[PDB]
Amino acid sequence: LSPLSTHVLNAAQGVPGANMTIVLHRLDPVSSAWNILTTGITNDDGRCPGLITKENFIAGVYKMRFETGKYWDALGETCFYPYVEIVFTITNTSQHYHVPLLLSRFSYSTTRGS
Amino acid sequence: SPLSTHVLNAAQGVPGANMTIVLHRLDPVSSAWNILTTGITNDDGRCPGLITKENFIAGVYKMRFETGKYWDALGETCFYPYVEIVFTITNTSQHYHVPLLLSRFSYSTTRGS
Amino acid sequence: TLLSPLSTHVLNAAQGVPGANMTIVLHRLDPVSSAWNILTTGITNDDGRCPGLITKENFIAGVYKMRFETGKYWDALGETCFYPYVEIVFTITNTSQHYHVPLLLSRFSYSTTRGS
Amino acid sequence: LSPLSTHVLNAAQGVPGANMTIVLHRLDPVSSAWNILTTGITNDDGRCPGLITKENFIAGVYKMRFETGKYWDALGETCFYPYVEIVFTITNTSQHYHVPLLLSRFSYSTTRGS
């Protein structure tokens, strides 16, 4: 029921990115600061249900921060990116938004899904 | 010039011409981002002279790519208003290529050399 | 209605929509000859998915290949593609796992990953 | 000086894919058949120079086979893709075509470059 979802895939190992800290932020429309909305941790399928509610899902500029450095380092390995932040604009509120992350130690990618 | 880049428009298979890229380094005591360079990609999607050897020290760097402005100049929207790639430099004798493959609704990066 | 142990998802990365009505053809390699036997011909639904790719009766360890009619998908949209088709060739080891093998495609790039 | 080039990038280790075999074919429009053009092995920098000469680089459908299974096995690890074939159409002969491969053990991607 969260209108915003995510999926973290460990591309190097071909398994879900489990136990990754994710932080969701929305741009404050007065200060130009990022306000924290949620912190979450991906489950064993690399997902994080409950990121936002329908009511709090308003048009805005959002930021999802993936704690890639802490993730890779609890697997005992270095990462080129200490974290990854994906910034994106939500204009149409009646759509579902899936903002996933494909990660190795030295690359990543993302796409918009529905 | 130890740090370089390449922007490729994956939707069109053309270089990402005319894109503003701004480079910063994190102040390791304040957690502020010190700007180093503002550059603009050339016809071949590259941006030479991002930094000098005299200025390229170990630390955390951020490259902000102005993807929203770039797509807007081509007459189209982008899901991302900007893209920031943040990365750790531990060894200064190395060359770091930090490119960007972009479409309107996706992007990808890899450490290259 | 049973669930195929092999599935896919085609995503049109350029337009940020599912890749719908793309023909996919699943083959398996005979490891004694080098013949590719066609198993299945599907077409992606409106969510870019293709259920029922294979039944357990045919789902054994081996080398498989999925061909995605990318030039055909793009042409039916009035645009060219760099790649006339794309083929993803992959090894199945553990017959008791699910394998998701999706495709993220524009006119000039594509990528795949082992989904779970 | 070849109008067709490639670059193989090991995405999981953030380094060049060295010593990977690449086989280049072109479809013969008269027969229904692929014709072998050359075979190379990527260097240190993950590249494979001189795949084809200007004279031989005619319009047509081409195919590049990257021996991914043999590359990972030689490096002591398993892959999910035992080979990778990229088939592509060359319609403008005066352009340069860069066809790279970014590869891990469970993911890969390609793009057309210039």
List the helices and strands and how they pair.
The structure is a homotetramer.
Chain A: E1 4-5, E2 8-10, E3 15-16, E4 21-27, E5 34-41, E6 60-66, H1 68-74, E7 84-90, E8 97-98, E9 101-103, E10 107-111
Parallel strand pairs in A: 1-8, 2-9
Antiparallel strand pairs in A: 2-3, 4-5, 4-6, 6-7, 9-10
PDB class: hydrolase
Keywords: hiuase, transthyretin, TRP, thyroid hormones, molecular evolution, purine metabolism, Greek key beta-barrel, Hydrolase, Point Mutation, peroxisome
Assembly: tetrameric
How would you portray this structure in words?
4 copies of one chain form a homotetramer. Chain A is mainly β. Chain A has a single domain (1-114), classed as Transthyretin/hydroxyisourate hydrolase domain (Immunoglobulin-like, Sandwich). Chain A is 6% helix and 40% strand. Chain A has one helix at residues 68-74, and strands at residues 4-5, 8-10, 15-16, 21-27, 34-41, 60-66, 84-90, 97-98, 101-103, 107-111. In chain A, the strands form 3 sheets. In chain A, strands 3-2-9-10 form a 4-stranded mixed beta sheet, with no helix packed on it. In chain A, strands 5-4-6-7 form a 4-stranded antiparallel beta sheet, with helices on one face. In chain A, strand 2 (8-10) and strand 3 form a beta hairpin. Chain A is globular, with a radius of gyration of 14 Å. In chain A, 39% of the residues are buried. Chains in contact: A-B, A-C, A-D, B-C, B-D, C-D. It is classed as hydrolase. Keywords: hiuase, transthyretin, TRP, molecular evolution, purine metabolism, peroxisome.
